[PDB]
Motif scaffolding. Sequence first.
Motif, PDB file in Angstrom:
ATOM      1  N   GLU A  22      39.133  85.236   7.710  1.00  0.00           N
ATOM      2  CA  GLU A  22      40.383  85.040   8.278  1.00  0.00           C
ATOM      3  C   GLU A  22      41.467  85.615   7.184  1.00  0.00           C
ATOM      4  OE1 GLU A  22      42.042  81.100   9.229  1.00  0.00           O
ATOM      5  OE2 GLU A  22      41.712  81.709  11.317  1.00  0.00           O
ATOM      6  N   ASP A  23      41.613  85.412   6.128  1.00  0.00           N
ATOM      7  CA  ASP A  23      42.578  85.987   5.191  1.00  0.00           C
ATOM      8  C   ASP A  23      42.209  87.198   4.782  1.00  0.00           C
ATOM      9  OD1 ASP A  23      43.974  83.691   5.749  1.00  0.00           O
ATOM     10  OD2 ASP A  23      43.132  82.413   3.952  1.00  0.00           O
ATOM     11  N   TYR A  60      43.428  71.305   5.942  1.00  0.00           N
ATOM     12  CA  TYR A  60      44.079  72.533   6.317  1.00  0.00           C
ATOM     13  C   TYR A  60      43.804  73.719   5.329  1.00  0.00           C
ATOM     14  CZ  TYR A  60      47.544  69.815   8.921  1.00  0.00           C
ATOM     15  OH  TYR A  60      48.003  69.133   9.936  1.00  0.00           O
ATOM     16  N   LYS A  61      43.993  74.793   5.563  1.00  0.00           N
ATOM     17  CA  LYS A  61      43.403  75.960   4.823  1.00  0.00           C
ATOM     18  C   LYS A  61      44.525  75.737   3.486  1.00  0.00           C
ATOM     19  CE  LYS A  61      43.713  80.187   6.637  1.00  0.00           C
ATOM     20  NZ  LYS A  61      44.508  81.303   7.630  1.00  0.00           N
ATOM     21  N   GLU A  70      37.772  80.669   6.804  1.00  0.00           N
ATOM     22  CA  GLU A  70      38.950  80.975   6.251  1.00  0.00           C
ATOM     23  C   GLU A  70      39.050  82.420   5.485  1.00  0.00           C
ATOM     24  OE1 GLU A  70      40.633  77.586   4.030  1.00  0.00           O
ATOM     25  OE2 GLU A  70      40.363  76.361   5.795  1.00  0.00           O
ATOM     26  N   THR A  85      33.450  75.756   6.470  1.00  0.00           N
ATOM     27  CA  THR A  85      34.749  76.204   6.967  1.00  0.00           C
ATOM     28  C   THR A  85      35.560  77.250   6.062  1.00  0.00           C
ATOM     29  OG1 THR A  85      35.865  74.228   6.231  1.00  0.00           O
ATOM     30  CG2 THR A  85      34.982  74.105   8.458  1.00  0.00           C
ATOM     31  N   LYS A  87      35.176  73.160  12.268  1.00  0.00           N
ATOM     32  CA  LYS A  87      36.640  73.755  12.350  1.00  0.00           C
ATOM     33  C   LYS A  87      37.629  72.895  13.412  1.00  0.00           C
ATOM     34  CE  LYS A  87      39.164  77.749  13.871  1.00  0.00           C
ATOM     35  NZ  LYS A  87      40.121  77.918  12.743  1.00  0.00           N
ATOM     36  N   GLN A 114      43.164  71.806  -2.654  1.00  0.00           N
ATOM     37  CA  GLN A 114      42.911  70.947  -1.302  1.00  0.00           C
ATOM     38  C   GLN A 114      43.052  69.508  -1.619  1.00  0.00           C
ATOM     39  OE1 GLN A 114      42.527  70.258   1.880  1.00  0.00           O
ATOM     40  NE2 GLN A 114      41.469  71.946   2.237  1.00  0.00           N
ATOM     41  N   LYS A 131      40.529  81.618  -4.257  1.00  0.00           N
ATOM     42  CA  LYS A 131      40.280  80.561  -3.226  1.00  0.00           C
ATOM     43  C   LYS A 131      40.810  79.198  -4.034  1.00  0.00           C
ATOM     44  CE  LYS A 131      39.972  79.070   1.096  1.00  0.00           C
ATOM     45  NZ  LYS A 131      41.317  79.159   1.888  1.00  0.00           N
ATOM     46  N   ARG A 175      36.247  68.306   2.989  1.00  0.00           N
ATOM     47  CA  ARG A 175      35.923  68.665   4.107  1.00  0.00           C
ATOM     48  C   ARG A 175      34.578  68.522   4.596  1.00  0.00           C
ATOM     49  NH1 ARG A 175      38.576  74.309   4.659  1.00  0.00           N
ATOM     50  NH2 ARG A 175      39.687  74.714   2.885  1.00  0.00           N
TER      51      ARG A 175
END
Lengths: 326, 326
Positions: free
Chosen positions: B169-170, B24-25, B166, B162, B16, B50, B45, B58
């Motif tokens: 987090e979301d 980026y996310k 995310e 990672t 991270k 990406q 997702k 990533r």
Amino acid sequence: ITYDLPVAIEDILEAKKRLAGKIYKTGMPRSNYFSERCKGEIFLKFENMQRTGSFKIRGAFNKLSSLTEAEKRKGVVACSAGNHAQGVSLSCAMLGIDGKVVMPKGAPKSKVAATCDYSAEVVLHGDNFNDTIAKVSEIVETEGRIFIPPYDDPKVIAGQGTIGLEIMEDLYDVDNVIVPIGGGGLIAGIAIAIKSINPTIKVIGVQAENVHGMAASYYTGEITTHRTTGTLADGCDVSRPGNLTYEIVRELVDDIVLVSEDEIRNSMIALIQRNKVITEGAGALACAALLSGKLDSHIQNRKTVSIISGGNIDLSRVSQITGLVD
Amino acid sequence: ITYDLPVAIEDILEAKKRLAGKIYKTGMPRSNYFSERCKGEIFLKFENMQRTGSFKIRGAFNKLSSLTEAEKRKGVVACSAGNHAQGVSLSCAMLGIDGKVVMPKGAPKSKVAATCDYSAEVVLHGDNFNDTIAKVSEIVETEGRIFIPPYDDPKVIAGQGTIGLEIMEDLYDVDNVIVPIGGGGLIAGIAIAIKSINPTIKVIGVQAENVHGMAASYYTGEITTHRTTGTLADGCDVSRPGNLTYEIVRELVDDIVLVSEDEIRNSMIALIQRNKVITEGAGALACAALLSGKLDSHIQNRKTVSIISGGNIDLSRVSQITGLVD
Ligand SMILES: Nc1ccn([C@@H]2O[C@H](COP(=O)(O)O)[C@@H](O)[C@H]2O)c(=O)n1
Ligand SMILES: Nc1ccn([C@@H]2O[C@H](COP(=O)(O)O)[C@@H](O)[C@H]2O)c(=O)n1
Ligand code: NA
């Protein structure tokens, strides 16, 4: 891995729906000072900046909003010398409900005035717990108003738990949540929210050395009263925990520590000087536990949220605490 | 409740840091159609959005960024006919590293061109797995370049994880995460991220009926090869899982289902028409499993994230799939 409890995760989710676009999420910033002291990441949940100055608007709004129209027509009644009175009063205003709040003669002037401002009828009765509570009883019999418990109520509990959902929303990788306890509604609500979603997150309680019904009950294995004397953390001055809140706490809370009056004062001074926030004794309990050293094996190299439950303290008391040789 | 694994939560946290302000996310919106079909909340997702069109940037960026300067001076080498080639190539450009990518003769034209665009030297060698892989070997011996595995590498694995951070987090209250599997680096990374923070969150794998080394290994209890034939989900055409990725998967993955070529096609058509997104076979595997009916006891009245791992599909194949009597 379920639990047969009087409150459940669904109750909290209903509370979230009822509060949406009415009651709002509070800020939860990192505290550099507490992080440095504790050698771990520390975050402050600002329920002192919630409407009315404490979290208690959440439980009261939920319970009042959940009433049917027939029930709302009956009117409501509550009893408090403090933050519950304010939450019930404001909630009544927001929902257009008629409400009476019985406050004891001797209740702090500031808090009487504030609950007046919030629109409910204030009834100052009784120089005695029995005399004050008997007025609420008299009001229930003669008027048929619905009583709104300060903590021992499934809807009230579920409203406080919305705080737990906000925490995992703002900090997914939180390890510990430190919560002050009086009657147990706050911590009960949070525990259910936290443990239902992520049981690896520790929920730890904090009470005053001077009075800790819940701690005594938690360590004895059954409900016991404890009160040696009064405390700075007047919001958590409760000799005997609620029935629903005890059942939940025994089941879901990881620990309960005790802090002295000096530690509470130190915590308030620290929050003022290092974090620029005003705190009542109850609101500083969690931070007092963090500085006590008692939570050290939980907080070092972890992320911990401290609940700043309230900021409703008379300015005279702010003047006194900041004026001490400190 | 720990695990003695070759990758750990700290490795993901390092990844991270290394990716911050570089990679980026991706968006993760609700799919109304998949939610309706599955009778539960479904979220997509978008690793197809990406950089390079898959998640593989990533793991490659993490591994390349983690190298010392002495190591970066050696130059790097990789081997792929697809998305790994693109990720390694772009990562090289971003970090200012000299990189060669050995691609098989017969590798898709679009993918050769794309990895050229991304700046690395492309070496087209071999009509055979042994001939192609032996070129990478020859390059390591004679040039001293550092090999960059597509999945069987702790830094590569940690970079894919990672994605798990995310997700929480979301969507803090996520119940299931559905992940496609080839070599196992993606799911291994996510499992570690997810299970380290909240082990109540289910991580479930998906592979093609035609080829599923990892599924076979998972259900046999040791590494076995399986490949009956090729598949639409060309990104997950892997007969034998990696060693590190198998150890992690056996330990942390809740299940692995299999989907047919028809189900994969149906899933791609559904994503195009109902969600307006372009998907390669591998990217649609998770959604194919959701429509198969096989995950029904996990997804009804729950919140589930489907990983859209990639969108790198030739337009000719998009033309064919959308042109079918469908
Ligand atoms: N009359 C009033 C009304 C509110 N207050 C206090 O002001 C603070 C902010 O109140 P509001 O959120 O309602 O703006 C609270 O701590 C509340 O107790 C007060 O001290 N006197
Ligand atoms: N020359 C190129 C370069 C990129 N691409 C594709 O375009 C998409 C977006 O690439 P970027 O993220 O690098 O903008 C990816 O799917 C990538 O594979 C391509 O088709 N031809
Ligand atoms: Na969040």
